[PDB]
C-alpha cells in the first residue's frame, strides 16, 4: 500500500481516453495509471508555490494534518494517442477499515492558482472485510480536455514539459462529516519518452 494514510488507501487511479471505433469496439489509452514499503521524502516547502495558498490551501491542510496523509506523485504522462466518439475519463478506487461518507476534491492549477475544481461525494460498499469506494468513469472536465489538445499540438517535447512545469493537480479526499483529511495528493507532470506512462510516489514532509 503506497498511497495510504491510517484511514484510507488509494489502490487504483487512472486517466484515460476511450475511443469508440464501432458499437462493439472500444480503444482505451491511459495517460497516467497507478495500480507497506516506505517511500522517499520530499520537503513540502519546495512545492507550495505550485499549489493553492491561503485557508484550505496546501500549507493550511498540511499543518492541520495528519502528516501521514500527504503525498506527492510525479507522473510521466503518455500522450501518444490519436486525438464525436471520444470519452475522456478518470477512475479511482479506495479502501478503508471505516464506513465513511467521503468527499473527493480535485483542483486543477496553473502557476499555483486554482483554475477548476471537481467535487464528488462517495459512499461505502462492504467488501471482503473492509469498505470500498469507487469513482468510476468520472468525466474529465473541459479545461483538461482543452489542455491535452493544446499539449499535443505543440511541435516539440521540451515545449510540452515546459508547460507541464506549471500545471498541477491537487486531490484532497475528506471525511464529509468530520472534515478529516484522509488523503491529500499533489500531482506533478512530465511527458513520457519511453515507449509508456510511469510514476514516482513520495511522502510530503515538513522539512
Amino acid at each position: 500500500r503506497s498511497v495510504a494514510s491510517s484511514k484510507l488507501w488509494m489502490l487504483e487511479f487512472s486517466a484515460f481516453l476511450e475511443q469508440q471505433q464501432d458499437p462493439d469496439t472500444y480503444n482505451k489509452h491511459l495517460f497516467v495509471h497507478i495500480g507497506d514499503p516506505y517511500l522517499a521524502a520530499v520537503d513540502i516547502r519546495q512545492i507550495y508555490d505550485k499549489f493553492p495558498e491561503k485557508k484550505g490551501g496546501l500549507k493550511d491542510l498540511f499543518e492541520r494534518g495528519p502528516s501521514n496523509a500527504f503525498f506527492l506523485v510525479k507522473f510521466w504522462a503518455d500522450l501518444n494517442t490519436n486525438i464525436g466518439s471520444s470519452f475522456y475519463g478518470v477512475s479511482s478506487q479506495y479502501e478503508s477499515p471505516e464506513n465513511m461518507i467521503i468527499t473527493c476534491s480535485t483542483k486543477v492549477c496553473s502557476f499555483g492558482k486554482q483554475v477548476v475544481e471537481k467535487v464528488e461525494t462517495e459512499y461505502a460498499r462492504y467488501e471482503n472485510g473492509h469498505y470500498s469506494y469507487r469513482i468510476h468513469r468520472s468525466p474529465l472536465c473541459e479545461y483538461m480536455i482543452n489542455f491535452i489538445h493544446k499539449l499535443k499540438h505543440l511541435p516539440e517535447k521540451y515545449m510540452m514539459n515546459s508547460v507541464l512545469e506549471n500545471f498541477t493537480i491537487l486531490q484532497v479526499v475528506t471525511n464529509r462529516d468530520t472534515q478529516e483529511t484522509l488523503l491529500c495528493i499533489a500531482y506533478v507532470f512530465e511527458v513520457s519518452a519511453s515507449e509508456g506512462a510511469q510514476h514516482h510516489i513520495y511522502r510530503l514532509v515538513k522539512e
Binding site: 520530499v42 510525479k74 496553473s110 502557476f111 479545461y143 489542455f147 506549471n166 519511453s194 514516482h200
Partner: protein, 40 residues
C-alpha cells in the same frame, strides 16, 4: 492579465518573444530527490 489564461500559457512556449506569464524556478534547479527526473 490573468495567470490562469490557457492561451497565454501555451503562447509563452510557442512564441517565447511574446511570452506573458509568471516567472518560475525550473523543477530541475530545486532541492528534490535524486531520481525525481529519471523514470523507473
Amino acid at each position: 492579465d490573468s495567470e490562469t489564461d490557457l492561451e497565454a500559457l501555451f503562447n509563452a512556449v510557442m512564441n517565447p518573444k511574446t511570452a506573458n506569464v509568471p516567472q518560475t524556478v525550473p523543477m530541475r534547479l530545486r532541492k528534490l530527490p535524486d531520481a525525481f527526473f529519471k523514470p523507473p
